[PDB]
Amino acid sequence: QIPPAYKDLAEPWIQVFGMELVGCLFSRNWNVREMALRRLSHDVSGALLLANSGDVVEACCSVLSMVCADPVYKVYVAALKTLRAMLVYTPCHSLAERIKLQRLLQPVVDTILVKCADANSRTSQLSISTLLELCKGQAGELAVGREIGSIGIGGVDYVLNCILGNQTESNNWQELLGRLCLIDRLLLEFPAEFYPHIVSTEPVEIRYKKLLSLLTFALQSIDNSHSMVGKLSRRIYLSSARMVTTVPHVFSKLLEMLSVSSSTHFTRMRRRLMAIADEVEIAE
Structure with missing residues (x-):
């Protein structure tokens, strides 16, 4: 019934x-x-x-x-x-x-x-x-x-x-x-779909539009009050940054995007990407 x-x-x-x-x-x-x-x-x-x-x-x-x-x-x-x-x-x-x-x-x-x-x-x-x-x-x-x-x-x-x-x-x-x-x-x-530079065969905002759309979404919840929502949002962003160290102009965009806010997690995130940058010798 x-x-x-x-x-x-x-x-x-x-x-x-x-x-x-x-x-x-x-x-x-x-x-x-x-x-x-x-x-x-x-x-x-x-x-x-x-x-x-x-x-x-x-x-x-x-x-x-x-x-x-x-x-x-x-x-x-x-x-x-x-x-x-x-x-x-x-x-x-x-x-x-x-x-x-x-x-x-x-x-x-x-x-x-x-x-x-x-x-x-x-x-x-x-x-x-x-x-x-x-x-x-x-x-x-x-x-x-x-x-x-x-x-x-x-x-x-x-x-x-x-x-x-x-x-x-x-x-x-x-x-x-x-x-x-x-x-x-x-x-x-599907890393090649989001990290075009790995296929060895134009500006950052255009070439990486798909990745940037997912990192924009991730950034909306890096301050989420649910522990795992917050953690996974931050971890996604940090993994993407690691992936784009071979292309510093892209890494620079991800660091830039963290200026949309002065809240603590953006500051923490920004200092984390600065550290990766130094570790890997791309601090220009």
């Missing part, structure tokens, strides 16, 4: 997937929810195949924005398998269709971003791995239309927009920490 508060949200789901299955999504028995999602993955696969689709992708994304928040790990896994099953049969051949899919999925990525900072490693690691796979676009396991020439969802740039978007709402400590946890893994996983 569907609780009264969810009647309007569930109605489009029912229209597409039928009352029986949607009811199971709300079951109190996690086995029933897990089984419902296993069935949903097949329902969605079969419906999308039938379109050699809009209603189906929309209702599936809507379901997934709910169940990807499920606190039961085995249900979350089933939810993520449904997400993959949808993506590989989804038709996306035009920038218009890309924009539409990006918006429908944004609430789903939001739920996953939160769980990147779940206390439990297997849940955070699966969440991080999922969004890293999304970053790989049409060469990853979440490629759009993988099972049937798709233009894909937008890879890293799309995930970056999700990380950096809707900041006035997705700003509690765990929503920030999950974003920061993913940011730290992005810089580690």
